[PDB]
Structure formats: C-alpha cells, structure tokens
Design an enzyme around this catalytic site. Structure first.
Site, PDB file in Angstrom:
ATOM      1  NE  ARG A  54      -5.779   1.999   2.215  1.00 52.20           N
ATOM      2  CZ  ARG A  54      -5.873   2.939   1.221  1.00 52.20           C
ATOM      3  NH1 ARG A  54      -5.378   2.894   0.090  1.00 52.20           N
ATOM      4  NH2 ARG A  54      -6.257   3.972   1.994  1.00 52.20           N
TER       5      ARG A  54
ATOM      6  CD  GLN B  10      -0.639   2.649   8.715  1.00 49.52           C
ATOM      7  OE1 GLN B  10      -1.526   2.675   8.000  1.00 49.52           O
ATOM      8  NE2 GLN B  10       0.443   3.145   8.457  1.00 49.52           N
TER       9      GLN B  10
ATOM     10  CB  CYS C 265      -1.014  -0.128   1.130  1.00 45.85           C
ATOM     11  SG  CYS C 265      -0.202  -0.377   2.865  1.00 45.85           S
ATOM     12  CB  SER C 266       0.914   4.651   1.210  1.00 40.18           C
ATOM     13  OG  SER C 266       2.045   5.729   0.705  1.00 40.18           O
ATOM     14  CB  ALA C 267       3.353   2.758   5.275  1.00 35.56           C
ATOM     15  N   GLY C 268       2.891  -0.049   3.418  1.00 30.53           N
ATOM     16  CA  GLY C 268       3.097  -1.405   3.500  1.00 30.53           C
ATOM     17  C   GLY C 268       3.031  -1.977   4.793  1.00 30.53           C
TER      18      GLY C 268
END
Ligand SMILES: [Mg+2]
Length: 284
Positions: A220, A261, A214-217
């Site tokens: 999601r 998160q 995803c963006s940071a991994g």
C-alpha cells in the site's frame, strides 16, 4: 495515453502478466546491513529488507539500522521515506528517524490489527493526557488533537527532543479503510486522502521527506508514492500522456524492493492515476 493501455490489459485479463514482467526487470541490490544477525529483531519480515545504498541511517553509534528506504524521484522533486510498521522495540527508532530527517508528516495506510493479527505497534498516544516517552531515544510524544472522518483520521502530534528541549509539530495521516483483502473498490477515497496530505504541506521540499508506511512498507505504501509521483509528472510535463506508470514503478524499485505487491495493486494504481488526471487537468 494510458487510459487506452488500461482498456487492453483489463479486456484481455493480462494484469498478472504485466505484473511479472515488472518483477523480472526490477533491480536487485545488496541488503547486507539488514541481514546482519544483530538486526534480525529490527525487521518485521525477513524477506523485506532495505537495499544498503538507499537505507536510512540513524545517528546513534551503536546500531544505525532501521528498516527504511529513501526514495528520491529526481524529475518530480519528490522524496519519500518508506518504512515498515514499527515493532514494539523499534518505536523509539521510528520517531528518532522522523526527528533526524525533519519529516513533517507520517502517512499510515494500515490498521493496527488486520486479519486477526497485529500488523503495527501502537506508536502514538490515544489520549491528550497520556503522553508517550521513548526512553532509548530520549523523545516525548503528545497527542494534541484528532480529527476523525469516514475513511481517514488526521492527528496533530507534538514531538519533543528531551535532550535539546526543542519540539516540532508532526501530522499523522491515517487511512483507515483499506480492505483486509484486496484493494478499495474505487480510488475516490484514496485520492481524496492523497490530496489532503498534499494540501497539508507535508510533501513540500521545505520539509524533510514524508514517512509512509503500511505493514511491510512496500505494498500500500508503494501505491501511495507511485500515484503521487505520476500525477506530479503529469503536471510538470509538456505531454501528460508521456508518463509510463511501469517505468516510474521500476525507477522507484531501484530504491526499495517489492513496491506494489499484487497485480490488483498494480491495477488499482493505474486506476487512481487515471481518475486523478481529471482533477488536475483543469476539471476541478
Ligand atoms: Mg478523551
């Protein structure tokens, strides 16, 4: 049973509390390679780093660093690579990792732009006739076909190692409807997406581990893996209510920090496992 445990946390609005117990109990290991100054521009977020023991290493001598962790789930016989959305300067590193680890699939769970900002580099081609070439890692990438659906897109890609002239076919699974804020209203589309990844062979052990991002991994991406593994353990085990989501999560957090998160992502994760149990305890 944890359908039961879901009732009680929800009834007593205890999600944020459950969630902090996990934060406190979660493992912490050194992230020294990630924090070297020569790697600062290989990291999209400075607070999201791979532990050194589980990090993926590139086979280039100069710098082997990519922000990516291998998550090895022993009982389930599943491995996953969780990584961050590539940066403009790490697109070639990303496909080098896919090449070196013999991955067959890439799961992407974010859009390239969310909340008015860029969350990922556009790391795959959009037109058959305009291929991409990564000069630093000597790789060529071609779009072969693209099947757009309501809540996800599947793309067939060809990856060519220009050095050795070999080529492999990679499947790109792109969940496109995760909401900008929050989590989906229902697990239905997400579970349908998960079973489509499963059906493709990409999670199977004849292949390298699947790359999930995803963006940071961690957010999601964490929800994807936690749900797959749990549903798998409920097939393998004699007792399909002996699966504790919280223990599974804490075991994956030994391998990458921060997975899952928000307390809402935790709730949604229970929700998708519970609902997925129906469609693999015989109720086709
Ligand atoms: Mg066209």
């Amino acid at each position: 049973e944890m359908e039961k445990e879901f009732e009680q946390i929800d009834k007593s609005g205890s999600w944020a509390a459950i969630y902090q117990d996990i934060r406190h109990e979660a493992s912490d290991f050194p992230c020294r390679v990630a924090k070297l100054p020569k790697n600062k521009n290989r990291n999209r977020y400075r607070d999201v780093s791979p532990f050194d023991h589980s990090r993926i290493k590139l086979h280039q001598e100069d710098n082997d660093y990519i922000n990516a962790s291998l998550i090895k789930m022993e009982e389930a016989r599943r491995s996953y690579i969780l990584t961050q959305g590539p940066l403009p300067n790490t697109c070639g590193h990303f496909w080098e990792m896919v090449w070196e680890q013999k991955s067959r699939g890439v799961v992407m769970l974010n859009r390239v732009m969310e909340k008015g900002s860029l969350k990922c580099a556009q790391y795959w081609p959009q037109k058959e006739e305009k291929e991409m070439i990564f000069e630093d890692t000597n790789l060529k990438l071609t779009l072969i076909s693209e099947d757009i659906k309501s809540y996800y897109t599947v793309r067939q890609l060809e990856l060519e190692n220009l050095t050795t002239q070999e080529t492999r076919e990679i499947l790109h699974f792109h969940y496109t409807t995760w909401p900008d804020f929050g989590v989906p209203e229902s697990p239905a589309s997400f579970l349908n997406f998960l079973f489509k990844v499963r059906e493709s062979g990409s999670l199977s052990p004849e292949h390298g581990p699947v790359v999930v991002h995803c963006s940071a991994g961690i957010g999601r991406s964490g929800t994807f893996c936690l749900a797959d593994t749990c549903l798998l353990l409920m097939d393998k085990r004699k007792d399909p209510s002996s699966v504790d989501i919280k223990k599974v999560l804490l075991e994956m957090r030994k391998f990458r920090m921060g997975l899952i998160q928000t307390a809402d992502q935790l709730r949604f994760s229970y929700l998708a496992v519970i609902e997925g149990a129906k469609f693999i305890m015989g109720d086709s």
